[PDB]
Design a protein around this ligand. Structure first.
Ligand code: PC1
Ligand code: PC1
Ligand code: Y01
Ligand code: Y01
Ligand code: Y01
Ligand code: Y01
Ligand code: Y01
Ligand code: Y01
Ligand code: Y01
Ligand code: Y01
Ligand code: MYS
Ligand code: MYS
Ligand code: MYS
Ligand code: MYS
Ligand code: MYS
Ligand code: MYS
Ligand code: MYS
Ligand code: MYS
Ligand code: MYS
Ligand code: MYS
Lengths: 213, 224, 172, 172, 224, 213
């Protein structure tokens, strides 16, 4: 068994700028293979034989390197390449895949916009309650959220999921959805969702009311 | 034209046995190999073994030599992978990709869709989708966000569309997160102009294959 | 056996040279994972010291004051130590190459450069279509001949260990 | 060298032990074209007769009437013939394996069955894309290992020839 | 769609040097190998060598190691084979066929048209074609034979058609035979009904590529 | 080098009848390959891996065999298969092709028809003379010819070429063309071409005249 390690694990490259990633191995493999995968899709083959290119590839990509060190060179990286690249070898049984370099687009920062969706009547009639706060067009990944109900700050009662990087419109989207029981749902009336970020200067907050709309 | 067909997903109770399927077309099923791989986000993608339909020979690795077995038949041009002793730590995606000697060494010419297996004792739960009516806040804006939150559903594979796929741009698919009790919950929102909110209809049609549950609900903007 | 201690030294030095020849024979570049008996360079110093011990036992054979009598016992004790060590490495490496690999030691840098894309410890093709191909038969032949070399080295080491143990039995 | 011809007896014994060891090691299944020293079966009877000669020379060292004195000369002459033959065939097979083969002698039926789809004398793939592939590196390792076997056998046979020539020059 | 293009034929004087060409299209020229073979009726078809465009490595055989050399470039996706020390006993057909690892071993997926080289000191001679007018013999018959004998021509490659390829069935292509002086002579006849002899015209258009000589003569039945 | 020999060199099989050819080798080759070639065409691949079939092959063909002996089996041979089959291996460098089995269609015999073409005026005006005798629909290959001029039999003054086997109409065609100088051309007037064969009972002869037609 031959272990393959590639660094860095995650790198951010500005559009229209040369970027290079390296894939080293614990042994001198005869040839190396590079594959990329998209969310909800199979890893499409990208580079074979360490020097050639698979069908349907942009001309910008050009793989090279010899010996125990192999590198991937991009002439001009764009937002279309927002995926993870895998390093694969075929010298020794069994073949072992690499870790993965998650490409990131490094453009100018953007001020996030906050949107709050009050729960519908059918949600209450079902037996639960759920209010959704929307986060979009923000960079970097970190985005602190502090829900306030009845002038009280609550933390640790919600879960957040990070989606894939958007191509052109936005960069990242954080799902800051707050869940609670019906007793606490009827205990409070006014709900607020304030998100602070390095982009916007003054933190904007959207607040609604319960029993009116 | 070469492609490999695989089932979407299925649920397997722990300690049971499941059989995979990978149908091949557009090329000689006997000549090419039938390599299988397994991808796990925690530990990356790793090899599991391969089978040659020409002679029935199989190759594995010492890590998972006895965990899985491979058996293929040339009559139906399909390869079957059977898993034994399922474990809660065996919830990943299994891919079916052929291998060819291209460019001077073995190379994966084509891959497969893959199966997202789920190992959990929880029973099947219907996809509960709820509307997210926008509110008439102070900030009017030139765009509005319409979402259809889905929570308390099983299993993970679920597809959320809008107007039967009419709207594609501006969508934000949020990956689901496992809950404490063993349930999934995700969200999906689309950005549309606020001027067309009162004229163009917006409906989300959730599709569930394991339970054959399809719901086409309508979300309407709320004026606060 | 005290009748022919001169010929016993010749047997010992012949065994040492056979060990040296086998060790140099095992240095042929084949796989980055060299045998456990080569990466420690056991045949080199072991064979040289067998030469020294056998020559000492078959040089004077008289009542020397300090050069011969005093050093003979320590040379024999070192010979027993090296012989049992060689037996242990041989028994370990036979199972290392024939059953499974449990101590993975890389080959030397200057010898592994010639053949860096090859491995012999675990050569089972990932593509099952190559099972009946020369690519696997070559590795099978490599493994078989390496196992034969290991077996012959083991039997020579065991015979030398028996001879030197008898010598120590003669000289309390 | 008439002083310790008994030690030379043990020399011949050890040389026979290693000659039969190398003969057994040469018949590892690799290619249908066996080495010219294997198909002739030279190492087996060569080592057996070396052991016989060493036993004759290192048994009594007394003045036997007919069983030893009469047979010693003929055994020594046969030993010289066998040793010069071994040297000739060894240095011929070295060129046979390193240069283009000029005798194509088939291997034994029972040893060629295991590996009938492989060859070792020549390996230059018809597809040049496999030049930097393990398929050729394995054959190169096989050739180097076989040449090492041939070299060690050749040098040991030459030393045996020198020793037995000394024995004969001692006994006119 | 994969195919390899080769020139028709050319004449080489003894002791000269000739260069072959084999253009590849429809597939990656760099990845696949460029195997060459030579076929001779006297001694069958034999291997001559191969070249890998990916790295420029070449392989040959001890029989003809120095007779021929191979050189290929990836810019034009063409492989060039150069022959040295041409001999009168080297008049055969050279084929250009790629090799792929298909079915478990190397296999010639596609071949090439091949070049029919001619090694002779004789100068180029135009294709002399003569009519073969049928005679009104006693046996009328329901069919008649029309031929256009070609003799005293050089080199061997020559194509004889009828009405610009309109008539294909009933043709009998006779292979040429070498003469004592070093010239070729062949024949070609077609069977047509005698009733249409006086109405439908029959013309043979001989085509000669090396000399660019095209003759379209007309043959007419003779009443004896 | 491994030599490959296959027998028989030439075999004749009746249509719609099972036929089998064998290809032995001096060594146990791992796999065998079968190729067929047509006149004026490249050898198209036919069978690979000793058990599979190439694209565009009839289902009747089925190759089998293991070890040092390999055989080709035809369920129902037809006239479409009138070609030569080659045996190829890939075990040892260099690969060596086989000899060749020329398939022949063994149907009922046919009586040959003789046609004679008098030379044209342009042939005489060029400086030479050539008369062509046509042979068709005859079997087997042997077909004796004995030209007679002025009641004198001449032999050895002509050359014959054997063409490929016809598919459906005929079986063999022999080019019995007689060549001579202008002096002998004008020396004789009547020319005859009689061909004897096992098919026809009474040898038919066609004769013409010089200076009249
Ligand atoms: C010293 C006295 C003389 C010893 C001569 C050498 C004897 C062994 C020769 C090699 C034979 C062989 O292949 O055995 C390998 C065999 C292995 O061959 P195997 O048949 O078991 O391989 C099994 C393959 N699988 C796992 C896939 C089923 O080793 C053993 O069987 C274990 C016992 C022997 C090894 C441990 C003892 C060695 C040291 C003492 C030697 C006496
Ligand atoms: C006996 C005294 C001790 C001899 C020890 C062994 C000496 C040779 C060791 C092997 C070295 C070697 O590889 O040489 C092969 C070399 C071959 O290697 P090469 O470098 O010439 O290979 C050339 C490769 N081509 C052809 C592609 C260019 O053999 C020779 O050079 C010929 C002379 C030696 C062989 C004939 C004499 C042998 C018998 C007397 C030995 C003394
Ligand atoms: C252990 C003691 C007693 C002896 C030391 C062993 C060395 C004398 C041998 C062991 C392996 C041999 C090596 C095996 C392989 C090669 C490759 C060889 O490469 C070539 O020059 C090949 C050229 C060609 O292929 O034409 C250079 C010599 C070398 C390093 C040999 C040098 C001598 C080595 C190191
Ligand atoms: C290329 C490598 C393998 C050579 C290493 C072999 C060693 C050999 C070479 C000469 C041998 C020596 C030759 C003769 C003798 C006899 C004997 O020494 C003597 O009798 C010398 C005379 C005396 O002291 O009376 C003790 C062993 C010795 C030194 C041998 C010891 C082993 C030696 C040094
Ligand atoms: C007793 C000494 C002094 C002389 C005889 C030594 C060798 C001629 C003998 C001793 C033990 C024999 C070995 C005993 C067992 C085997 C197992 C045999 O099977 C395998 O290891 C794998 C065979 C395969 O891969 O097909 C290979 C030959 C071998 C090493 C034999 C090779 C010849 C050996 C080394
Ligand atoms: C690798 C193992 C399994 C086999 C090794 C075989 C030989 C290399 C060994 C086995 C016993 C050894 C023999 C043990 C005893 C003697 C007696 C010795 O002569 C005497 O002691 C005779 C006493 C006298 O002359 O009175 C000559 C060397 C010899 C044959 C030794 C030579 C080398 C032998 C044959
Ligand atoms: C030359 C004199 C002094 C010793 C005779 C040598 C034999 C003891 C050795 C030489 C090669 C050995 C053979 C090498 C390879 C094999 C393959 C082996 O096949 C197996 O059983 C392998 C089974 C498996 O792979 O699990 C059977 C033993 C055999 C014939 C060995 C039997 C013993 C042989 C003939
Ligand atoms: C597995 C194969 C390699 C074993 C073949 C090795 C042979 C060895 C085994 C025992 C050795 C014998 C052991 C002891 C002696 C001492 C000597 O004979 C004696 O001294 C016997 C007593 C006497 O005659 O006084 C002559 C050599 C001989 C027979 C050796 C000859 C070589 C023998 C027969
Ligand atoms: C003097 C004796 C009693 C002890 C030493 C014997 C071996 C340790 C030495 C003697 C000559 C050496 C050989 C000298 C030359 C070479 C050439 C060398 O290069 C090759 O033949 C090919 C290397 C390649 O393929 O890369 C391989 C090692 C080898 C056989 C050496 C292997 C080790 C040998 C056999
Ligand atoms: C393969 C070739 C190139 C190298 C072989 C090296 C050794 C196996 C040979 C070389 C010289 C041989 C030595 C030649 C002389 C003797 C002397 C002999 O003792 C004596 O004759 C001393 C005389 C006395 O005691 O008075 C002991 C064996 C020995 C070392 C021989 C042992 C084996 C030796 C070292
Ligand atoms: C007393 C003789 C020397 C005994 C120790 C031998 C050491 C050999 C060098 C180290 C071998 C391992 C090298 C690993 C880099
Ligand atoms: C007789 C003692 C030998 C000791 C070991 C010497 C062999 C060289 C050891 C170093 C090899 C170079 C590798 C260094 C990384
Ligand atoms: C002969 C010197 C003692 C040798 C004891 C065995 C050494 C085995 C190799 C070293 C093991 C190292 C394990 C990896 C750290
Ligand atoms: C005298 C040596 C006896 C064997 C020493 C231990 C060898 C390792 C144990 C056997 C293998 C177990 C580990 C397999 C992964
Ligand atoms: C000081 C005398 C003993 C020297 C022992 C040297 C052992 C290693 C010899 C080979 C070294 C590597 C050579 C590579 C060219
Ligand atoms: C006097 C000892 C025997 C010498 C002759 C050895 C013959 C060995 C058998 C013949 C070897 C070649 C076999 C070819 C079939
Ligand atoms: C010590 C004399 C040995 C003579 C050779 C015996 C080996 C067997 C020879 C026949 C091998 C079987 C092959 C017959 C075709
Ligand atoms: C040791 C007995 C004499 C051997 C002489 C050399 C024999 C070489 C092999 C036989 C050659 C046969 C040539 C093919 C017919
Ligand atoms: C003592 C042996 C010297 C060499 C004996 C002749 C070997 C054959 C001649 C060299 C090779 C020539 C033929 C090459 C095809
Ligand atoms: C009669 C005592 C000497 C016998 C020598 C036999 C030599 C050949 C031994 C191996 C024969 C092949 C065994 C295959 C299973």
């Amino acid at each position: 068994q031959i272990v393959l390690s590639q660094s860095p694990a995650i790198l951010s490259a500005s559009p229209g700028e040369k970027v290079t990633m390296t894939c080293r191995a614990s042994s001198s493999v005869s040839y190396i293979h590079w594959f990329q995968q998209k969310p909800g899709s199979s890893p499409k083959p990208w580079i074979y034989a360490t020097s050639n290119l698979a069908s349907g590839v942009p001309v910008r990509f050009s793989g090279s390197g010899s010996g125990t060190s192999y590198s991937l060179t991009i002439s001009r990286v764009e937002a279309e390449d927002a995926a993870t690249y895998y390093c694969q070898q075929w010298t020794s049984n069994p073949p072992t895949f690499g870790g993965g370099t998650k490409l990131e687009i490094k453009r100018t920062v953007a001020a996030p916009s906050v949107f709050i969706f009050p729960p519908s009547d059918e949600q209450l009639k079902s037996g639960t309650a759920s209010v959704v706060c929307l986060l979009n067009n923000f960079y970097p990944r970190e985005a602190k959220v502090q829900w306030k109900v009845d002038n009280a700050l609550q933390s640790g009662n919600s879960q957040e999921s990070v989606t894939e990087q958007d191509s052109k419109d936005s960069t990242y989207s954080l799902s800051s959805t707050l869940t609670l029981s019906k007793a606490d749902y009827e205990k409070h009336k006014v709900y607020a969702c304030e998100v602070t970020h390095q982009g916007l200067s003054s933190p904007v907050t959207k607040s609604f009311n319960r029993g009116e709309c | 034209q070469v492609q490999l067909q695989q089932p979407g997903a299925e649920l397997v109770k722990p300690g049971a046995s499941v059989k995979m399927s990978c149908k091949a077309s557009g090329y000689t099923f006997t000549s090419y190999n039938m390599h299988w791989v397994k991808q796990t986000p925690g530990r990356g993608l790793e090899w599991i073994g391969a089978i040659y339909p020409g002679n029935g020979d199989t190759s594995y690795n010492q890590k998972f030599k006895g965990k899985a077995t491979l058996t293929a038949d040339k009559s139906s041009s399909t390869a079957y992978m059977q898993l034994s002793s399922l474990t809660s730590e065996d919830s990943a995606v299994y891919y079916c990709a052929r291998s060819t000697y291209y460019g001077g060494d073995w190379y994966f010419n084509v891959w497969g869709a893959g199966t997202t297996v789920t190992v959990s004792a929880a029973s099947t739960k219907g996809p509960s989708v709820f509307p997210l009516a926008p509110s008439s806040k102070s900030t009017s804006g030139g765009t509005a966000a319409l979402g259809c939150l889905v929570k308390d559903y099983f299993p993970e594979p679920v597809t959320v569309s809008w107007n039967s796929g009419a709207l594609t741009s501006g969508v934000h698919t949020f990956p689901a997160v496992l809950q404490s009790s063993g349930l999934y919950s995700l969200s999906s929102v689309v950005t549309v102009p606020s001027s067309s909110l009162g004229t163009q209809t917006y409906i989300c049609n959730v599709n569930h294959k394991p339970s054959n549950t399809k719901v086409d609900k309508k979300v309407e903007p709320k004026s606060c | 056996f005290m009748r022919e201690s001169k010929t016993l030294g010749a047997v010992q030095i012949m065994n040492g040279l056979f060990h040296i020849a086998l060790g140099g024979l095992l240095m042929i570049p084949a796989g980055i994972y060299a045998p456990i008996c080569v990466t420690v360079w056991y045949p080199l110093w072991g064979g040289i010291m067998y030469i020294i011990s056998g020559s000492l036992l078959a040089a004077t054979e008289k009542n020397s004051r300090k050069c011969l009598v005093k050093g003979k016992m320590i040379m024999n004790s070192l010979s027993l130590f090296a012989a049992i060590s060689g037996m242990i490495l041989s028994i370990m490496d036979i199972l290392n190459i024939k059953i499974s690999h449990f101590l993975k030691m890389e080959s030397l840098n200057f010898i592994r450069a010639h053949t860096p894309y090859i491995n012999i410890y675990n050569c089972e093709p990932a593509n099952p279509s190559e099972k009946n191909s020369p690519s696997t038969q070559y590795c099978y032949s490599i493994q078989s001949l390496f196992l034969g070399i290991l077996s012959v080295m083991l039997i020579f080491a065991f015979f030398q260990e028996l001879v030197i143990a008898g010598i120590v039995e003669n000289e309390w």
